[PDB]
Structure formats: structure tokens, C-alpha cells
Design a protein around this ligand. Structure first.
Ligand SMILES: Nc1ncnc2c1ncn2[C@@H]1O[C@H](COP(=O)(O)OP(=O)(O)O)[C@@H](O)[C@H]1O
Ligand SMILES: [Mg+2]
Ligand SMILES: [Zn+2]
Length: 661
RNA sequence: GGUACGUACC
RNA sequence: GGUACGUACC
């Protein structure tokens, strides 16, 4: 039966009376249950007053649509009202305009509403209540704020029709922590709180205060630790890679103004690779390309075990053999290419055997081991999460746990959890694969997640006894969310990091920022109504101006026979701009009748690459379309030469040219 | 593919 | 504003 707790009621009270508010409840409090109570109460009143009651619940992830239906929204509203969940994933055969007419409570991803609002029609007047789950994203150019700026534009247009009366929905913001917006001062922290209040049109932000004793007993915070590693072990792997990197730099004559295995080095060598590609300096760019891989190995050794650093290099040269070697069904090896390959093969014997000695592994891995061992022996049936930065680190830590049988002995049974986006070097986990791992984690089949930021917000994950942030420090919101996953009995939160990395210091800034947030919320709540209304109006007014400036900026092509495509590695003439066409208005393809002569095919739409004939540089991959084998060219791999200038682009849209169908 | 947000570094 | 890492939505 649908009932609230006393702290839940306290916070819900103004939204039941018909006021726009933001609800701030910690993780595990039941903010989604408060939403269901407010939606029924809102709709039950509209029945008794003989009026059109309609709710729309907006969420930031597709899994949350399914999730809010099963657990909360259907059980209490299905028999009494028409309820539905939507997303871009679900291929529905009804238009969203019609889905509005037919249903009382619509749970969906926020972009589905905006798609309809943009262009029978949909307007925000059609809904009487709008609930925005995870409402701290109602900011900048996000989907929530684009929905809300229409509401504010209608609010201003409504006062014009008072003087010369279009209806407007109630608004409910739901979140754990609103954030401070990277503010380093209490003034800027308060400014950010008022801005998201102004974005959601909240007449008051709401927190548990009177019944704060009940909330503290309901959700119990973990014990916070900070496991620092000074890293005063000898590192012969780092030293031996540096010697290789130093040898390569003397060959190509490219010297840095920065330390080896650092981020400013990574930026430098990519810029140097891009310069050397533009200026037809094959020697320099190939050395810069290889130097980046040796630079990756150093920073891989800094986070995960050095066997991974070896494999990153070892796989790179394995793929170079595949591309450079002339297979059947078809020299590529330059002096520079032969020099770099010999250099690896010479020092490959040592690096492989040096990597097998765990005395020279990273110290953070020993700290991670110690933290895992003592905490998984602590309880009968434990559960935990290791937050790491990269996808590679997540997979590599999963192998480290598996290739070390004392974790299997003690109780741990691990599995990685990563994103589904396709803009990384590491492969993605699909949304269905993500769903299956979190289910097994809850069931007990899986014991320990090694996740990226995928695991921190929104998704329903089982209560953890331990959550470790293995080197990862993001922002104040994500810190509270990661700490919020630890809510089992005798739970602990931990930050395993190197003192040299500066992550320990950046966490203390987030702790400082989290304190400013609670002070700021208090000050905005205590603020008198006239002072509040003035400030909320000012931010609402300048928020509209902000979009007009970006709209005019975005409002700011030529002719396709102006350009030609050179191979970035070897500078050979390949295509004119007239040869290009687009498929589905996204994937670009070359048409030229005698294009087959200039490339070869290798395995790793299709799993068949396209590489240069003369030099073995990747151009892209093949694809089937209407029973025709067509070559998909990725813009990354080409130097575009103009008639008037030579430049490289990362995306096809960055060109000042439109192409045919 | 497009777009959004987060973080570090310039 | 740029480079990368990360996550997401259509
Ligand atoms: N008033 C209540 N009475 C009984 N159970 C509740 C109440 N509020 C919440 N719950 C339960 O507690 C859980 C809340 O979890 P969740 O919705 O994930 O919280 P949040 O969204 O704040 O993280 C749900 O499983 C729900 O069944
Ligand atoms: Mg919930
Ligand atoms: Zn080439």
C-alpha cells in the first residue's frame, strides 16, 4: 500500500500542495517512491475537481524507464491509471503525440519529449506535472534544460497574455546532490545552487531537517579510508621503456619539453604526429605514432600491472606485421618502419621476462590486494565495486584478479562493467551485457564489479560492503554517489591512489566542495522570498540570453571538386572530393571505378579493414549495401589538400563541404 | 554517425 | 577554445 515515511512526507509536502520544488534525498532514501506518491496524489485531485490530469516522468538513462515501471510506478498506479514506458530503443508503432492522448503517466527518456516539442502536436501545456529524475543535469545545454527553457519562455509569454492564459505544468526535481558547479568559493557554490533552482523554476529547494534522525537511521554512511602509496619501489620497466623512447627520439630528432609517461607528453606527441603528417614527414610521424604507444605503456604501468603495458606494445607490433606483410589474394616496410621493429624485437626478450616478476609491479596493486583481502574475509556474503578510469584498466584489473588464485580461494568472483559508447580504443559492452552483469551481481553469481563511471549513477546496483575508487577522482556529485553505493552493514569507502598523481589532493577539494554545498543549500532555504524571487528571475532571464548567443553562433560549405585526399603516412594521391558519397547520411564512401587497385583487405557492417597498398596505413573498412562491397573511409587517416593549405580532420562534419546521397 | 554532460591537461 | 580519457542520449 502506497505510504511515505515521515522524512519522505516532510520533503514531499509542498509538491502535494502544487508548488514547484527540488527534492534532495540521499541514495537509498526512496526518491522514486516519493515521485509515485506525488503523481497519484496529483492525479487523484484532478479526478475529484473534474479536470485533465497528466504526468510525464523524465529520466537520463534508458534502463531507468524499465526500472521505474517495475519497482515503483506500475504496482501503485496500473489498476487506477494508464501507465507506459518509452525509449528510442523500444520500436513503438505509435507516434508520441498519440501516446500522450492515450496515457496518464508517461515514463521516458528526456530526448523523446524534445523530439516531439521540436518538430496533432505536443506542448508542455498538455502535461499538468513534469517530474525530472536526476535533476542536477538541468544545466547548460543538456536535454532537461532545453525542455525547461521552453517552459520558462512560455512562462514569460503567459504574462504577455495576462495583459494582452495558456496552462503550465507543475515541476518536480529529484536528485541526491545538486552540486556546486566546480566552484572554489562559497559565493560561486551558492550561485550554482540558485542557477539550477532557476532552471527548474523551483520556488523552494527541499531537504530533510525536522525528521533528520529517521533519515540517518534509514541510510547509514560507510567508514571512509584513504590508502596512499608513495611508490618508492625501483621501477626497471619504466626505466627500460624510457631508454627505448630516448633512442627513438634521437632517430627522428623530436625532443619534448615534458616528462615521459605524462599527459603533457601525450598531447605533445599527438600534435607532433599531426604536424609531421601535414608536412609530408613520414619519418617523424611514424616515430611519433610509436612514441605514443611507448608513452601509453608507462602510464599503463603507473595504474595496472606491467604485463598489460607489454601487451599494449606487443599487440601494436603484431598488428604492424599483419598490415606490412603481403598476404595472398592481394614494399611497405620503410627504413623508419624497419628501425622501430628491430628496436622492439631486440628489447622484447627483456621486457616480457621483466614483466613476469611481481616484486617490480605497481604499489597500488598491493594496496588494492590488501584492501580486497581484508574486506572480503570480513563478512559471510560480501559485495563490492572498484571504480577505475579507463576501460583498459577495468578489463586489465579483471584479468589481474583472475590470474591470481588467492582471490578465487578467499571468495572473490569478479567481472568488469564498462560503457556502451563507441568512441574508445577499448571495445564496448552492449546495454544487454551491462544488464546481465548487474543482475548476476545482485544474484550472487558475480561478487566484485570493476567498473568505470557507468556504475556510479542511476542504475540499481546491489548494496556493497566495499567501494574503492582506484585512482579515479571526478567531481563532488559522483563522490557522493560512489560513497552512496556503500550502504550495507559495516560498509567502507576507499580511495586507493598514488601520492604523486595528485588524486588525494583533488578528493579533498571535492570534500571541501561537498561541505560548501550543504552550507549553500541552508543559505538559499533561509533566504527571504523577495531576495530569492529576484535572483531566480535574473538567472532565468540570462539563461534565455545564453541560448540566443549559442543559437546565433551555431547559425554561422563550398563545392566538392575543390579538394583531394592524401594518405597521412605516405602522401600518395588517392581520391578527389568528387569521388565521395554518403550512405544513410553518416558513413562516407568512395565511388571511383578503379579504387580497388589502391588498397588491400585484412581482418582484425564488416570485420574487414582497408589498408594502403603502398604503405599499409589504415584508411577504414569495407561494408555491404544493396549487395555491393563498398569502401568506408574514416577521415582520421587522410591529409586533405586544398587548391588554395593541407589539414587533417577528426570528423567528416569538420570539412566545409556537403556530399551527395 | 550526430549531440550532451563529466574529468584531467594545454 | 583545443587534446585526450570517461559516460550517456537520439
Ligand atoms: N515509504 C516506504 N515504505 C516502504 N518501502 C520503501 C519506502 N520508500 C522506499 N522504500 C523501498 O526502499 C527502496 C528505495 O530504493 P531507491 O528507489 O533506489 O532509492 P533512491 O532512488 O533514493 O536511490 C525501494 O526498493 C523501496 O521498495
Ligand atoms: Mg530509486
Ligand atoms: Zn599510404
Amino acid at each position: 500500500d502506497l505510504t511515505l515515511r515521515d522524512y519522505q512526507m516532510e520533503v514531499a509536502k509542498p509538491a502535494l500542495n502544487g508548488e514547484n520544488i527540488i527534492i534532495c534525498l540521499p541514495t537509498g532514501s526512496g526518491k522514486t517512491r516519493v515521485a509515485v506518491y506525488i503523481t497519484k496524489d496529483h492525479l487523484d485531485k484532478k479526478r475529484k475537481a473534474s479536470e485533465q490530469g497528466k504526468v510525464i516522468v523524465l529520466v537520463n538513462k534508458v534502463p531507468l524507464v524499465e526500472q521505474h515501471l517495475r519497482k515503483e510506478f506500475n504496482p501503485f498506479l496500473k489498476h487506477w491509471y494508464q501507465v507506459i514506458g518509452l525509449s528510442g530503443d523500444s520500436e513503438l508503432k505509435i507516434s508520441f503525440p498519440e501516446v500522450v492522448k492515450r496515457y496518464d503517466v508517461i515514463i521516458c527518456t528526456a530526448q523523446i519529449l524534445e523530439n516531439s516539442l521540436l518538430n496533432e502536436s505536443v506542448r508542455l501545456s498538455d502535461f499538468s506535472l513534469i517530474i525530472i529524475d536526476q535533476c542536477h543535469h538541468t544545466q547548460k545545454e543538456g536535454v532537461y534544460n532545453n525542455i525547461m527553457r521552453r517552459y520558462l519562455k512560455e512562462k514569460i509569454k503567459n504574462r504577455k497574455q495576462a495583459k494582452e492564459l495558456i496552462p503550465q505544468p507543475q515541476i518536480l526535481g529529484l536528485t541526491a546532490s545538486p552540486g556546486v558547479g566546480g566552484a572554489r568559493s562559497n559565493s560561486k557554490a551558492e550561485e550554482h545552487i540558485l542557477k539550477i533552482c532557476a532552471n527548474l523554476d523551483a520556488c523552494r529547494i527541499m531537504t530533510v531537517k525536522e525528521h533528520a534522525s529517521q533519515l540517518k537511521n534509514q541510510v547509514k554512511e560507510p567508514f571512509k579510508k584513504t590508502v596512499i602509496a608513495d611508490d618508492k619501489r625501483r621501477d626497471p620497466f619504466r626505466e627500460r621503456i624510457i631508454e627505448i623512447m630516448q633512442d627513438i627520439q634521437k632517430y627522428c630528432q623530436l625532443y619534448p619539453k615534458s616528462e615521459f609517461g605524462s599527459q603533457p607528453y601525450e598531447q605533445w606527441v599527438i600534435r607532433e604526429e599531426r604536424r609531421a603528417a601535414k608536412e609530408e614527414k613520414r619519418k617523424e610521424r611514424v616515430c611519433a605514432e610509436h612514441l605514443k604507444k611507448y608513452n601509453d605503456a608507462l602510464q599503463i604501468n603507473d595504474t595496472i600491472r606491467m604485463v598489460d603495458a607489454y601487451n599494449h606494445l606487443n599487440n601494436f607490433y603484431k598488428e604492424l606485421k599483419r598490415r606490412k606483410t603481403a598476404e595472398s589474394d592481394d614494399s611497405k616496410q620503410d627504413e623508419t618502419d624497419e628501425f622501430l621493429m628491430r628496436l622492439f624485437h631486440a628489447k622484447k626478450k627483456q621486457l616480457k621476462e621483466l614483466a613476469r616478476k611481481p616484486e617490480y609491479d605497481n604499489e597500488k596493486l598491493m594496496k588494492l590486494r590488501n584492501t580486497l583481502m581484508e574486506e572480503f574475509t570480513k563478512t559471510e556474503e560480501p559485495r563490492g565495486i572498484i571504480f577505475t578510469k579507463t576501460r583498459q584498466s577495468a578489463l586489465a584489473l579483471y584479468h589481474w584478479i583472475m590470474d591470481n588464485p588467492k582471490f578465487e580461494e578467499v571468495g572473490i568472483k569478479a567481472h568488469f562493467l564498462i560503457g556502451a559508447g563507441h568512441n574508445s580504443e577499448t571495445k564496448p559492452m552492449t546495454q544487454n551485457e551491462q544488464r546481465e552483469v548487474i543482475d548476476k551481481f545482485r544474484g550472487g553469481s558475480i561478487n566484485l564489479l570493476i567498473a568505470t563511471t557507468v556504475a556510479e549513477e542511476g542504475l540499481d546496483i546491489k548494496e556493497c560492503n566495499i567501494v574503492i575508487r582506484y585512482g579515479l577522482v571526478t567531481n563532488e556529485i559522483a563522490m557522493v554517489q560512489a560513497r552512496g553505493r556503500a550502504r550495507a552493514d559495516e560498509s567502507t569507502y576507499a580511495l586507493v591512489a598514488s601520492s604523486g598523481s595528485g588524486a588525494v589532493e583533488r578528493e579533498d577539494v571535492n570534500i571541501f566542495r561537498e561541505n560548501m554545498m550543504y552550507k549553500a543549500i541552508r543559505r538559499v532555504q533561509e533566504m527571504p522570498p523577495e531576495e530569492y524571487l529576484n535572483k531566480i528571475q535574473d538567472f532565468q532571464l540570462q539563461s534565455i540570453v545564453e541560448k540566443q548567443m549559442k543559437a546565433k553562433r551555431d547559425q554561422r560549405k563550398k563545392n566538392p571538386s575543390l579538394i583531394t585526399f592524401l594518405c597521412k603516412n605516405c602522401h600518395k594521391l588517392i581520391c578527389s572530393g568528387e569521388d565521395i558519397q554518403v550512405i544513410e547520411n553518416m558513413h562516407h564512401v568512395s565511388v571511383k571505378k578503379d579504387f580497388q587497385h589502391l588498397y588491400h583487405k585484412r581482418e582484425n557492417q564488416t570485420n574487414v579493414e582497408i589498408i594502403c597498398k603502398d604503405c599499409g596505413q589504415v584508411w577504414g573498412n569495407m561494408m555491404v549495401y544493396r549487395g555491393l562491397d563498398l569502401p568506408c573511409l574514416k577521415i582520421r587517416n587522410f591529409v586533405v589538400a586544398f587548391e588554395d593549405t593541407k589539414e587533417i580532420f577528426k570528423k567528416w562534419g569538420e570539412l566545409p563541404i556537403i556530399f551527395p546521397d
